[PDB]
Each structure stands twice: as C-alpha cells, then as structure tokens.
Structure 1
Amino acid sequence: SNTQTVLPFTGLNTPSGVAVDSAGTVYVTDRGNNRVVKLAAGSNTQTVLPFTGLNTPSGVAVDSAGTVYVTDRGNNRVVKLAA
C-alpha cells in the first residue's frame, strides 16, 4: 500500500505544468485560469504570481535564483519573473 498527497492548491482549472525549487516551493501553471500559482513548503495558502496577459500558460520552470519561467502558449512567448 502507498500514499499520494493532494497539494492544497485551490480553484484550479486544467493545471498543465509543475516545477519545484530547491526550497520545496511548488509552482503550477493553472492553464484554464490564465495564471501561475505557488505553494511554499509547509505553507497552507497559495499565492498567485504577478504575471500579466497570459493565455493558456502551458509549462513552468524555476532556476537557482528563484526566477520563474513560463511558456505562454497562446501568445507564442516565454515570460520570466524574478524572485
């Protein structure tokens, strides 16, 4: 027998991509809501990252400085946001 854990993100619609940084913060592209949300390790409350003008964001990555990169699928671009 095994255990899987549902992360306490809220109000997701068609989540499309996930990244995890060195601190254990989890970042998710909430595709159907045109937004990117995150949850700190231990934290109970998701925060919405201040990207703008997203259309169907499809993927997310985070580098060693905590910069977050997102593929903005509907706008044919990749956007990044410093920590």
Structure 2
Amino acid sequence: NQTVLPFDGLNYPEGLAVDTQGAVYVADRGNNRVVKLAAGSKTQTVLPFTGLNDPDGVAVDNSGNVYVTDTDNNRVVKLE
C-alpha cells in the first residue's frame, strides 16, 4: 500500500526520519528548512532551525531532540 504523505511545497526533500510517535521529519533541502508532519496530520510544521544552507540529513533521538546536517555550513545543529 503506497501512500503519499500530505507535506506541502517540498523542494528536493532529502533526509528523513521518523520518531516513536510516527511523526515524519524531512530535510527540505531546496527550502533550507526542516519540516515535521505528525501522524495523521495534514499540516506540516517548519521547525525553528535558523541559518541552514542546503540541509541534507535529519535524525531524531529518543527524547525528541532533532539533529540536522547543515551541509553547506559544514556543521551539525541540534534543536532541543
């Protein structure tokens, strides 16, 4: 059963992660942002990272912290 998740206006999405609650996180590379879609939701949320330049990878730990590879700034950023 293939389903398309109701994200909005993605622009070359690259990294993705899924947490224990079924929320899906996407490094929306072409929009320099990380978006999150809760399970069952139709409205995605742009997370409050700042200063990203072509973010590639996203990861989420067991306590809900979100990590992104900010590729063109050669750094890894954590949002708590």
TM-score scaled by length of structure 2: 0.98
Query: How many angstroms does 1:67 deviate by?
Result: 0.2
Q: Give the one of 11, 31, 50 matched to 1:52.
A: 50
The alignment yields a C-alpha RMSD, in angstroms, of: 0.5
Larger Rg: 1
The percent of aligned pairs where both chains have the same amino acid is: 77
* Stretches (4+) displaced over 3 A: none
How far apart, CA to CA, are the structure 1 residues paired with 2:49 and 2:11?
17
Q: Which runs of 5+ in 2 are unaligned?
A: none
Q: Give the one of 5, 9, 17 matched to 1:7.
A: 5
Query: How many angstroms does 1:76 deviate by?
Result: 0.1
Count of residues in correspondence between the two structures: 80
Deviations 1:15-62 (A, max 9, x none): 011000000000000000000000001111100000000000000000
